[PDB]
Write a protein that binds this DNA or RNA. Structure first.
Ligand code: UPC
Ligand code: CA
Ligand code: CA
Ligand code: CA
Ligand code: CA
Length: 903
DNA sequence: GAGTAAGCAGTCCGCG
DNA sequence: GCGGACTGCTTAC
């Protein structure tokens, strides 16, 4: 097989690489790597190395990596550019794997682990590690085994062995309900003292050395706790055995809020799953506890136990160990669904970076572009310092706040990357400039055509048509990968809907789910069988379909993120190819595009409807337009339609057969106008929205920019079995809005959009009537707790103190001297509740860590003093007021002359 | 060390 | 009691 790297590190003048050899065996090697860098030379000098602008360079081959670094300094002291890859492990990887990396995941050791630590004195800080590590579950992807390290004897209690028989029993049977599919995979190792447990853990670590190290919060908790604990017991160099190359760094992160210390284990690629989740999932959760995310991603119940975690090992060791094991499994289950480890690996090897560098689009693209240019013997520029400057982004049309009955939306395929490719925007494709007209002049086709010769953006930039830039070339490769996966996700999504329609009439027989590939639209024959299947079979199929759609989602959305990342990175000063002319070329072309096509669409629709100057485009943002289809519908008359699906079919056909061509024609003209390399402005229909036919539903509404609601029947070709709400920006979409209020507001919106004013009024009355009976957590607000110290004036609120911070300060005072009350962590999320005046907390609000029940010592008082009135007004009524007034609708029956009668 | 646009809640402060 | 300037947080794209 072809060889591929596992990890690479630079240590002095040495490259340390773990790799898989041709026999598929894991190896390590120290390499005295001899780097190269480049200096411009005169034209007189024969060379095969040119920089990106075509200037000749001379190769400087250094005897070691320090030599190359010193040379960079000397070049700075002279005032001349030092060209080439300055991150030597990237050059090494590039030189060592000069071919497309084909990797095999079954040879890559992936470790998932979680430790337990009993603490009678509050949170066990990793930097101190003054408490015994009393459990470790470590899952090894190559043995496919959960290795369990269990401390029986500890200063905090001596316990009996954990029972695999009891762990496997149902909870309702006194057992721990450890999932059956992993019972046979547990290897249990009890220990009578800490020292032998850790020694045995290290010895096992050397034998099964992680390549990818993951789990939940491993980077901030488990890894540094294990390191510092081993350090304190055995010494630093023993703790250093956690590194395959016996090198570590007690690191520091430089950002915006705080000052922490994590451990860099050299020769290991750490991907804390919480970080993967935050980057790749595109959710913002009110909490990031594993219980919460597990419930969210998998619909498994919260791991139940009695009393604090600081007493769990002693009161119920049986459950303590089982839960340690289950928590490890849960991350594996989330990854089986989301597939972020697979994605990370795909991207890492594609770019030829250290795998942990997937968190940095900038690093990722620097490597991709470097490897691309090197193939053509081109020499990359030296990174330069730049001052941070703001620059303009997208256009957003101010919408008229209102209800909007029928709406058809259209949006450009991969807009920013497509602009890059259309205009040929790259550092080396710059041809010059032209004198700009005001933007509106391009929008309205009155401005002098920018160029006969070059490809242009209305920002003033000109690019070569006759040659490809490394940016367009490489962004196109990743775009095409993205396209393929979106194709799979949408097919699976459509297949899902075929299955949901078939569940309306489930057959009564014993059958099996069909062996199909959900990535491709079901054949007619498959559709026929589906119509005969049992409910059991169908639901299993729906599950499989939905798991396929999730996988395509992960793979498509994050390749999209990567390419969109390339466009944004051009405006980041740390990017080697930083250039505000290129960044601005994209955004400004985007602004023109959106407003250009708004004009063309109003023109076209006025023409086909035989009217003039009517406004069909009601709203737009970045690359999207929203079209009022009321007149399209009135033109034919609502009477002519059989059911809802009939008119959805009409507008679908209208968009595809009439509008899109007119849109295409409009953009091809703009392409010619800007003399672009390639026409790539593809604006496909997104949503088809309206009320159910015959209903009092209002279809949709806008309250302002980025704030709207649509009852959608078809989305990018997916015809839903049931209408689905498309809500953007409104409180139901915000993680700060309480759970039960999101739910309540959404149901209000659903009623407005599908049923009408009377239905809405009915529901509102009920909610206000019953809401006081909701669980306090479900009605608590959520906020990130940033810069807490800044507003802490002797335990009390300082000036300009934010509401949620004041609650944190209220919490701190009420738990002062409470030994095991959970401390709020700076930068993390809290629940927040308003308090009635005269409460025994002495302030107007309280806040405690999200995802957790509030400590029982102050829960009582919180429940008693919660201010339901304020909580409803603030989170529910006031947003609902915004929705309804914009929609010209009432949530409560207004007073009227009819009040004089008895109905 | 991907980007900008833009909405809403809240504090401070003015207002016979 | 509510506006406007201000920060903080959060979303749409
Ligand atoms: O996180 C983001 C989101 C958007 N955009 C910019 C760049 C985006 O190109 C642009 C439009 O945003 P969408 O309509 O959501 C996306 P796109 O067109 O990428 O992908 P489709 O083919 O529609 O799934 O906004 C960003 O720069 N960053
Ligand atoms: Ca735990
Ligand atoms: Ca788009
Ligand atoms: Ca059937
Ligand atoms: Ca869009």
């Amino acid at each position: 097989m072809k060889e591929f790297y596992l990890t690479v590190e630079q240590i002095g003048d040495s490259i340390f690489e773990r790799y898989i050899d041709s026999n598929g065996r894991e190896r390590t090697r120290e390499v005295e790597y001899k780097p190269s860098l480049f200096a411009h030379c005169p034209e007189s000098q024969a060379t095969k190395y040119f920089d990106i602008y075509g200037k000749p360079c001379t190769r400087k081959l250094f005897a070691n990596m320090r030599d190359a670094s010193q040379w960079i300094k000397r070049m700075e002291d002279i005032g001349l550019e030092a060209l080439g890859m300055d991150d030597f492990k990237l050059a090494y990887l590039s030189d060592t794997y000069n071919y497309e990396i084909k990797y095999d995941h079954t040879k890559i050791r992936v470790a998932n682990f979680d430790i337990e630590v009993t603490s009678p004195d509050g949170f066990p800080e990793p930097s101190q590690a003054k408490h015994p590590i009393d459990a470790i579950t470590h899952y090894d992807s190559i043995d496919d085994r959960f290795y369990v390290f269990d401390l029986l004897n500890s200063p905090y209690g001596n316990v009996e062995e954990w029972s695999i028989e009891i762990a496997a029993k149902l909870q309702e049977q006194g057992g721990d309900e450890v999932p059956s599919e992993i019972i046979d995979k547990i290897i249990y190792m009890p220990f009578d003292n800490e020292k032998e447990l850790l020694m045995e853990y290290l010895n096992f670590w050397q034998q099964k050395t992680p390549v990818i190290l993951t789990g939940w919060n491993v980077e901030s908790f488990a890894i540094p706790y294990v390191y510092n604990r081993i350090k304190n017991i055995f010494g630093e160099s023993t703790a250093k055995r956690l590194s395959p190359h016996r090198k570590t760094r007690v690191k520091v992160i430089e950002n915006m809020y705080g000052s922490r210390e994590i451990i860099t284990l050299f020769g290991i690629s750490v991907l804390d799953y919480i970080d993967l989740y935050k980057k790749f999932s595109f959710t913002n959760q009110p909490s990031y506890s594993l219980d919460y995310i597990s419930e969210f991603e998998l619909n498994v119940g919260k791991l139940k136990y009695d009393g604090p975690i600081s007493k769990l090992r002693e009161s119920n060791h049986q459950r303590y160990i089982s839960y340690n094991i289950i928590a490890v499994y849960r991350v594996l289950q989330i990854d089986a669904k989301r597939q972020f480890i697979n994605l990370s690996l795909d991207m890492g090897y594609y770019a030829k970076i250290q795998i942990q560098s997937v968190f940095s689009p900038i690093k990722t693209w620097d490597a991709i572009i470097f490897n691309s240019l090197k193939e053509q013997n081109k020499v990359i520029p030296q990174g330069r310092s730049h001052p941070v400057q703001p620059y303009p982004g997208a256009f957003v049309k101010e919408p008229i706040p209102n209800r909007y009955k029928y709406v058809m939306s259209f949006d450009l395929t991969s807009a920013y990357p497509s602009i890059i490719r259309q205009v040929n925007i790259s550092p080396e494709t710059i041809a010059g400039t032209f004198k700009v007209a005001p933007l509106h002049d391009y929008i309205n086709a009155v401005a002098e055509r920018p160029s006969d010769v070059y490809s242009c953006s209305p920002n003033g930039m000109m690019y070569y048509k006759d040659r490809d830039g490394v940016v367009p070339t490489e962004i196109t490769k990743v775009f095409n990968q993205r396209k393929e996966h979106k194709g799979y996700m949408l097919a699976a999504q459509r297949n899902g809907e075929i299955i949901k329609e078939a569940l309306h009439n489930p057959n009564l027989s014993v059958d099996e789910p069909l062996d199909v590939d959900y990535r491709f639209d079901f054949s007619d024959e498959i559709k026929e069988k589906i119509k005969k299947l049992s409910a059991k079979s169908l639901n299993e199929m729906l599950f499989r379909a939905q798991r396929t759609e999730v996988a395509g989602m992960t793979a498509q959305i994050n390749r999209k993120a990567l390419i969109n990342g390339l466009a944004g990175a051009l405006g980041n000063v740390w990017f080697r190819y930083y250039d505000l002319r290129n960044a601005t070329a994209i955004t400004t072309f985007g602004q023109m595009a959106l407003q250009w096509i708004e004009r063309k669409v109003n023109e076209y629709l006025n023409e086909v409807c035989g009217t003039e100057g009517e406004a069909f485009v009601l709203y737009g943002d970045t690359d999207s337009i929203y079209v009022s289809a009321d007149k399209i519908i009135d033109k034919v008359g609502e009477s002519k339609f059989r059911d809802t699906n009939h008119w959805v079919d009409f507008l679908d056909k209208f968009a595809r057969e009439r509008m899109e061509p007119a849109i295409d024609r409009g953009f091809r003209e703009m392409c010619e106008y800007m003399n672009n390399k390639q026409h790539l402005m593809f604006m496909d229909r997104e949503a088809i929205a309206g009320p159910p036919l015959g209903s009092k539903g209002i279809g949709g509404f806008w309250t302002g920019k980025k704030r709207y609601a649509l009852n959608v029947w078809d989305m990018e070709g997916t015809r839903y079995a049931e209408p689905k709400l498309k809500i953007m920006g409104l409180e139901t979409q915000k993680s700060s809005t309480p759970k039960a209020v999101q739910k309540a507001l959404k149901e209000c919106i659903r009623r407005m959009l599908q049923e009408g004013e009377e239905s809405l009024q009915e529901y509102f009355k009920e909610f206000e009537k019953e809401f006081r009976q909701l669980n306090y957590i479900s009605i608590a607000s959520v906020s990130s707790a940033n810069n807490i110290a800044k507003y802490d004036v002797g335990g009390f609120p300082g000036p300009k103190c934010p509401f949620h911070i004041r609650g944190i300060l209220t919490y701190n005072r009420a738990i002062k001297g409470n030994i095991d009350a959970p401390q709020v962590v700076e930068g993390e999320k809290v629940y927040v509740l308003p308090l009635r005046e005269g409460n025994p907390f002495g302030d107007k609000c309280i806040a405690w860590p999200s995802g957790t029940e509030i400590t029982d010592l102050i829960k009582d008082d919180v429940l008693h003093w919660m201010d339901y009135t304020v909580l409803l007004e603030k989170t529910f009524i006031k947003p609902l007021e915004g929705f309804t007034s914009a929609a010209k609708l009432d949530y409560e029956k207004k007073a009227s002359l009819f009040d004089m009668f008895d109905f």
